[PDB]
Symmetry: D2
Subunit: 47 residues, 4 copies
């Protein structure tokens, strides 16, 4: 049945997109951590 094949695909896509979402959130955390590093450099760049 194609409807059962469609089901397997839909579940997989949901699962892929949820992972991409988790990774994206983890990336945004890293970007903040990168902003903090930029800041430390700026503080050191003055003295």
């Amino acid at each position: 049945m194609i409807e059962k094949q469609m089901d397997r695909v839909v579940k997989e896509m949901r699962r892929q997109l949820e992972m991409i979402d988790k990774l994206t959130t983890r990336g945004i955390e890293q970007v903040e951590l990168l902003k903090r590093i930029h800041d430390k450099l700026m503080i050191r760049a003055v003295d």
Copy 2:
């Protein structure tokens, strides 16, 4: 200064990741809409 180049890049990356996030959310909505389509098909046969 490198530090100002780093700043421009960090800001850009955040902006890219926020877009990817919006698109991902939009995709999950579409996947639900696809689950609804699969259900209609199940009802039809």
Copy 3:
């Protein structure tokens, strides 16, 4: 010597974005598995 901390973060971001890339490519495959399903339905 933060730079080592910056390094650890940059490597991790590279790793995260490469995963997102693999998943994105897997999604595009799926999107075509779906177009084939659409086609089978049309043939019906």
Copy 4:
């Protein structure tokens, strides 16, 4: 109707995913640009 509706959805998703892909590639470029910045910092450190 459902078949054509499904088609709309699928085209939309393919478009969303291709954008995510472009952005991901742009992120990878930025990460390289960041590696280069780290290196410059290393050179300036000594």
